[PDB]
Amino acid sequence: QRQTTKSSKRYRYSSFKARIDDLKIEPARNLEKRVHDYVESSHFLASFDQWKEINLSAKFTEFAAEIEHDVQTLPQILYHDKKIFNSLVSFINFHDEFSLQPLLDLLAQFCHDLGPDFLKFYEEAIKTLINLLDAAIEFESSNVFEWGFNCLAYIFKYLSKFLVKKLVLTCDLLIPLLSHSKEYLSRFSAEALSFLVRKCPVSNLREFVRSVFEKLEGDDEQTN
Amino acid sequence: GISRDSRHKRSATGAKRAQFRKKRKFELGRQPANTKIGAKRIHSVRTRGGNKKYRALRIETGNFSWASEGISKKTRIAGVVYHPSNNELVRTNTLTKAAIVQIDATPFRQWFEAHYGQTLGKRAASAKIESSVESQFSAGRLYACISSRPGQSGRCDGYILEGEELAFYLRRLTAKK
Amino acid sequence: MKLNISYPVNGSQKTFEIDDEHRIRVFFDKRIGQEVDGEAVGDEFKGYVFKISGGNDKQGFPMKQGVLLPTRIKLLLTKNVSCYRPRRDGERKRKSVRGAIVGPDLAVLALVIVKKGEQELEGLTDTTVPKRLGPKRANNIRKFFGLSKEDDVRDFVIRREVTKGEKTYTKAPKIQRLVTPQRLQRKRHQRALKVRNAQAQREAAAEYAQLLAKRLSE
Amino acid sequence: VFDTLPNVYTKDEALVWKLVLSFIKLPDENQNLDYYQPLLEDGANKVLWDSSVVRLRDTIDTFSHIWSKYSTQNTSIISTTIERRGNTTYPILIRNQALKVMLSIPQVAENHFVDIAPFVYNDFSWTEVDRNVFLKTLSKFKNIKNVYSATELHDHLMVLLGSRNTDVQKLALDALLAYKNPTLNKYRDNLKNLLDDTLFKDEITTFLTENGSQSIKAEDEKVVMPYVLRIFFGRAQVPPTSGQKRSRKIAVISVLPNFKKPYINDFLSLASERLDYNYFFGNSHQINSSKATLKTIRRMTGFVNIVNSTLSVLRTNFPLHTNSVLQPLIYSIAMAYYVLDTESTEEVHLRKMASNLRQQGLKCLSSVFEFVGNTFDWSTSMEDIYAVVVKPRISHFSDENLQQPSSLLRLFLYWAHNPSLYQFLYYDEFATATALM
Amino acid sequence: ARGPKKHLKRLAAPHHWLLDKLSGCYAPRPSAGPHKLRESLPLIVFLRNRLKYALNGREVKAILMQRHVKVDGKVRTDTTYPAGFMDVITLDATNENFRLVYDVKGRFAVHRITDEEASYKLGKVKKVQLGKKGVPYVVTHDGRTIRYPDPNIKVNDTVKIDLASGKITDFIKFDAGKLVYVTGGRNLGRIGTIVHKERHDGGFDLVHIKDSLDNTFVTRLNNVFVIGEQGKPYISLPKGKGIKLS
RNA sequence: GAAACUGCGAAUGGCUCAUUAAAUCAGUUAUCGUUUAUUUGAUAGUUCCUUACAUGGUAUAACUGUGGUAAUUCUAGA
RNA sequence: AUUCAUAAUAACUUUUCGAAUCGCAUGGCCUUGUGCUGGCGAUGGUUCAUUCAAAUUUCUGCCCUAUCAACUUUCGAUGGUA
């Protein structure tokens, strides 16, 4: 019996498991005035300016100093591709929540700008993301889970056609998070990879189904 | 009834002060517990703060300490003999502080026998005691001054009257008889 | 008067009006807590034995035990007494209450049946009403069912079938005072917390003693 | 049935007594349903897939259960036959039900009693609720002195009075007052107020004190001192967790020094009588049974604690009796040495209690030697106390005792200071002498 | 009155709160706490009238029940908690630590503070004593009882306290030539080195202080608060460094 | 989530100046002469000691029902 | 400045306290027991300190009146002891 008849007060308690059980993933089910899709001088730069206004944390302030000297325009991003990404990955591995929100948003939008050239950073981006999510298990925060899995949904959505072409490597990456021994990790990672599965056409889908059935027979002992 | 303010007395110069307020609760008094000798019976009074205070109406036993030996025994109080404030208290057997009661002596002489290997009446330097104390032991009752406030704590604790006080109160008893 | 008679074994109760004065004179001079005779009351109460339990006089002022004065009186009632319910903490109202000795002016005398007579009275002896609720403590359920100490209670909770339209639905109490893994963990935490704090205190005291002895050996 | 039966037992009071005694005996009696068990069959297979949706799991479980039944048809036939035959096991509280019935009907048990006294003399195992109900029945008994075995009931009654549960003490005092005699009828309220917890010490100083008002007379003392000693034994077995209980125990042993010499000896005889020493002294120094248990060592520890307190309050005037004081002491310390030698260093609780018993035994030995010394004989038991000295100690007495004056050391010093007590030094090959050296 | 007051009028309030005299009748009576009544800043005054992070008392409730405010390492949720002098108030989402310390003009002063300086807190050892079971303790100027202090700590001596463990890191004696902050009286906020303790018996010990422009004044030992040595304040002083001018 | 038990508050606030002439009050002191809910910081292994701690026992409210009275924030019996 | 803080001794007590309470979660273990352990935080509780207080309290300061010069003490007025 979850909370069915809402009360008259305004601030419920909402324990962490209740917040996760309420949580879902699809931002396309969601919608708002998306700032990065709304203003278009540069996606990364627009989101960067909004987050420079909104966020006041030490880690994001230092990141803002460095990359604010670097990026102000699209050829600057396209040239300094590696430096930006390594600084982003450095602070995400620093693992600080107050700064963990904007860096995840910027990772999504940075891929959106750097589209079909992101496929060389893409692997260790996913690696740092799943390390972040297991750290979030260690510090329970529904906020961090929602942000990180929305970043994964955005990366899948932005690099649809290439990961769809190469679907088996993506699930080979996400199996440490798909078969993870926590109900919500398996739930959210399955929802994101489920969006990609819905996007995939019939032939690569047949290959992926054959591969995942072979992998399930490999994980005969695993039920999760 | 009782209150203990200083606004209803005469002035220091000898004037009569007119009234300033109604009586206040923080200047209350309570009715004295004329604690007598009988079976143990004790009220509890709730006092400022939430603090308990035990009044004794009748109390039989008590804790009396031998100061020269530094020990303490629980004895039975016989009756009040002398009291420096009111011989009506002496008459009515009221137990208050600074009263002079006679107590039982059997636990003290039992401790003395078991501690010094010697009876009383009829390590020798340690065994030697005072002459009037030995006379009281032979009599069967000991003189003891009460030093507790049995209307406040509900305990009658005292000390056995040692040499100089015993001399003074013996003169007092013999002169007042 | 009117006799409010109650059979506590069935939890049943009824009222019988009384007009002739002979049974009233039987009731005279008796007090609350005494006994009377149903045969001396009337015919249908042959064998029954009552007990004067309470009543109200002709204006409403109820009977109160303790006061042996067959009149009305003004008592200073307190927190924990009958015939008075205080509206505010430490309040002592003074109320008019009727004494306990049964006189003539009682509008209602209320009796309880101690011993059943020989004939079945209509409302009292025949029918009954069940208890409203079952036990709520775990040991109360173990008593009321005679359950052994090795047996569990959550399988023997008493349920009630409620219905609203077509959705049949059951209800059952939360068994207060029931031993759980939760309470076991809480007791364990109290123990471990006391132990941890005592260890920290001994450690800090030993460190201060070391510092002090170092100062003195300096 | 509880209010119906007291009106209808009068018709046939014999059969109802047979039923009541049968219900008393029934929880102790065995029950077996050892049915016919056929040979085991290994008929089992995962007939369906295991699913994750729960209602499919439930239907698959139902079908697999029916399949397992029909595959092991034989054992399932037997189990279904049993489960439809239905139970016959008496629920355990039926003894409590029959004891409540017997409590409501005191006169039939009072008439018979030849079938209930075995439970009393076997001392029940029954629970404390049933014990209290049965002792309430014994209080309700009317012709109590004319029961089947009156004095043996009296003995077990006095033991249950000496027990430490004050409720049990109240019940046993009520039954002993049901035993009627004018001395206890005179002092009837006094013992009840002694059992009362609030009036306890005030009552003690009220009428147990010698040479005062309301004191016990001489013949009444002779007839009543068993009762007072049993109730004082219970109040002394009260354990000292807090200041109030410590003060109660101290009050008991500090009013002990005024009774009389054989009454002090009888109290201490009780305290030793709970233990045993006839093992050693039916042997010489060998223990028959290896009773190295926590139960018997905690009995010895309670004994030596009450002996220490009694000596500290009776430093010179107490009686020593060889049959009640000295023999259980050397039994205690020999048992301490025995458990220390016999069982390993894994038993931390038993070894720690053994060390505490050794400490307190040597402490009371040194205390009693300091306290009586030359005032009574020793030649009866010189050899035994010397044996319980010389087994574990003199081999490493210098290696152990070199830091402080030990209790054993101070006992040696008292031995060497007093002339008649040279016999122990004389008794060995001056082993304790060379130990001092 | 027949009991303790619960209301504070607007003009009855302490002056240094800078509460304007038209926005109502009542000023946030600061609840009982570590600091005294006439020298405490409630969190509602601090967050609303000073930082302008809130516009209403309902917004101060929203902030505190969101659990952002921490006063000396611990979360507070009572909006009239008496945050006093030498306090550390950390706002995490804003990434700021504030040492509460007086200004030269006699008012409290926001002092932006970094993490390594916010990690500790001074405290004026004010009552050194021997407690139950024979342990010694010190009572500083904010109620903090610290058992087992250094044996040389005396009355009126500053102790630097590590916050996250409540422990004494080190201490600063009361001798002539130390740097002294003045907290009460006319000159409060004037940081100056202490020259001479004029000591009377049964009266009040005055203290002659002389500050960096070599100006001399006198206060009492109750208002004196030792900071550090000559030219080495353990804390970072506000702007102007406590100098009263023309 | 009604009701009722429990906890806290109702001793603050608001109004008025009748009384009171070293009284109140103002400034200055003292408590080494006392109580203090709350807030804040610290604080309590006592191991054993002779014959349930996987956690003792009673009730009572609200409620069901029977009533009284011209009437009140009246209440009685079960 | 103390008979202070604190400690120790001997007893005393219609005698206190030393958690039979509550929310979220579910991790570490393994003798695979429904066994052992474990996080965050709510209420409470002995003492001590702190704070909001409270009650007493020291000095000095009140308008008109001498056609008001003596006043207070049985009935406490001033001090001493209990």
Textual characterization of the structure:
The structure is cut from a larger assembly and holds two copies of chain A, one copy of chain B (177 residues), one copy of chain C (218 residues) and one copy of chain E (246 residues). Chain A is an all-alpha fold and 224 residues long. Chain A has 13 helices and no strands. In chain A, helix 9 packs parallel to helix 12 and helix 11 runs antiparallel to helix 12. Chain A starts with 15 loop residues before the first helix and ends in a 6-residue tail after the last helix. Chain B is α+β, with helices and mostly antiparallel strands and 177 residues long. Chain B folds into three domains: 30 residues, no CATH class; 112 residues, no CATH class; 35 residues, Ribosomal protein S8e, subdomain (Phosducin, domain 2, Orthogonal Bundle), CATH 1.10.168.20. Chain B is built from five helices and seven strands. The longest helix of chain B has 14 residues. Chain C has 218 residues and is of the alpha+beta class. In chain C, strand 8 and strand 9 form a beta hairpin. Chain E has a five-stranded antiparallel β-sheet with strand order 3-2-5-6-7. Chain E has three helices and 18 strands. Chain E has three domains: 116 residues, RNA-binding S4 domain (Structural Genomics Hypothetical 15.5 Kd Protein In mrcA-pckA Intergenic Region, Chain A, Roll); 51 residues, Beta Barrel (OB fold (Dihydrolipoamide Acetyltransferase, E2P)); 71 residues, SH3 type barrels. Chain E is globular, with a radius of gyration of 19 Å. Chains B and D meet through strand 4 and helix 2 of B and helix 13 of D. Chain C binds two RNA strands through strand 1, strand 2, strand 4, strand 7 and helix 5.
Strands of chain E, count: 18
Largest interface: B-D, 15 and 18 residues
Shape of chain E: globular
Number of domains of chain E: 3
Q: Write the element-wise H/E pattern of chain E from the N-terminal end onward.
A: EHHEEEEEEHEEEEEEEEEEE
Q: What portion of residues of chain E belong to β-strands?
A: 25-35%
The biggest sheet of chain E amounts to: 5 strands, antiparallel
Strand order of the largest sheet of chain E: 3-2-5-6-7
Gyration radius of chain C, rounded: 31 Å
CATH class category name of the largest domain in chain E = Alpha Beta
Q: Could you give the count of β-strands of chain C?
A: 9
CATH topology of the largest domain in chain E: Structural Genomics Hypothetical 15.5 Kd Protein In mrcA-pckA Intergenic Region, Chain A
Structural class of chain E: mainly beta
CATH superfamily of the largest domain in chain E: RNA-binding S4 domain
- The share of residues in extended strands of chain C comes to 15-25%
